């Protein structure tokens, strides 16, 4: 839980699954807060939920580029999510 945020499981009928997160996705940011470790993510989700933020942008990574397209510039991974209600004990739905 102090390892890099590498998604393993995708919880069924959850936010993460509905907005379409796949196994292997590496979340690097949320709104904001730099995500390096799982701790930073947990903290950020709670902060945002109590801040009253209902929706925000989740940035991740998926796969390596094709050869001769290493240095290519494109949108990182703009993906808008609903923030889980921590009061109602709601989860995002990801686990290593």
């Amino acid at each position: 839980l102090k390892e890099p945020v590498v998604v393993g499981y995708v919880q069924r009928d959850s936010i993460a699954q509905k907005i379409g997160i796949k196994p292997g996705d590496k979340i690097i940011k949320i709104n904001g807060y730099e995500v390096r470790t799982w701790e930073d993510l947990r903290d950020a989700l709670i902060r945002l939920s109590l801040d009253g933020v209902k929706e925000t942008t989740l940035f991740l990574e998926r796969g390596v580029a094709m050869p001769g397209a290493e240095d290519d510039v494109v949108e990182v991974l703009h993906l808008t999510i609903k923030v889980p209600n921590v009061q109602k004990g709601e989860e995002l739905g990801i686990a290593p």
């Epitope: 796969g63 094709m66 001769g68 397209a69 290493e70 240095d71 290519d72 510039v73 494109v74």
Partner: antibody, heavy 117, light 110 residues
């Protein structure tokens, strides 16, 4: 206005030099890497060469024996494919392409290259 | 390192659905992205599907891409097939190099 225009193709004798051009326009040239793909009647699509956006590295196909060399000229927003030691197998339609990280988003019209005596 | 396998030709009726297959030889299908290109007889290839399943706004909705993990293959589903689909459909992926498919050649009966 995304366009990729090929040129410099036609006819050449086996084991000789020929340089293909591919002028690009209507997008930041130095932001995206370039490529080349040929299409014969039989083989179909078959990747040849790819340069990076920064032009730090170049990549080639397995059906080339390090004979061709891919360059780019950001000044004229053009990229080139020099070809040496050609053969009758190399006779194909040569499309140039534009990369977008994980695929070829745009292709050119293609130019005919024929190797014969 | 790997290669892809496509049907040399396929046929379908006007209004029918069709599944064009693309089977990988070695490696995990999902680890490296898979893309799909249409090409009419004597035309430049155009993007049907990229990043596995993502369709570029412009291509009809009836087209769709998928990743069948069981067969280590990619598939292209075309609902309510039209006459304008009379074209070759190549699949594409990469790793250390860049690979294309054999070339599926769709025909439209009716």
């Amino acid at each position: 206005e995304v366009q990729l225009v090929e040129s410099g193709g036609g006819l050449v004798q086996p084991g000789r030099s020929l340089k293909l051009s591919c002028a690009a326009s209507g997008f930041t040239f130095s932001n995206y890497g370039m490529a080349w793909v040929r299409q014969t009647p039989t083989k179909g699509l078959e990747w040849i060469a790819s340069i990076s956006a920064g032009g730090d590295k170049t990549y080639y196909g397995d059906s080339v024996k390090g004979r061709f060399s891919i360059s780019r000229d950001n000044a004229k927003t053009t990229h080139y494919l020099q070809m040496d030691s050609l053969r009758s197998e190399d006779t194909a339609t040569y499309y140039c392409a534009k990369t977008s990280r994980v695929y070829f988003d745009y292709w050119g019209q293609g130019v005919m290259v024929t190797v014969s005596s | 390192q790997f290669v892809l396998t496509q049907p040399n030709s396929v046929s379908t009726n006007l209004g029918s659905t069709v599944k064009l297959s693309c089977k990988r030889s070695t490696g995990n299908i999902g680890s490296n992205y898979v893309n799909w290109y249409q090409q009419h007889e004597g035309r430049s290839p155009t993007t049907m599907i990229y990043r596995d399943d993502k369709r570029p706004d412009g291509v009809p909705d009836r087209f769709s891409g998928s990743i069948d993990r069981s067969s280590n293959s990619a598939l292209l589903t075309i609902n309510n097939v039209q006459t304008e689909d009379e074209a070759d459909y190549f699949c594409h992926s990469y790793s250390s190099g860049i690979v294309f498919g054999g070339g599926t050649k769709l025909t439209v009966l009716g």
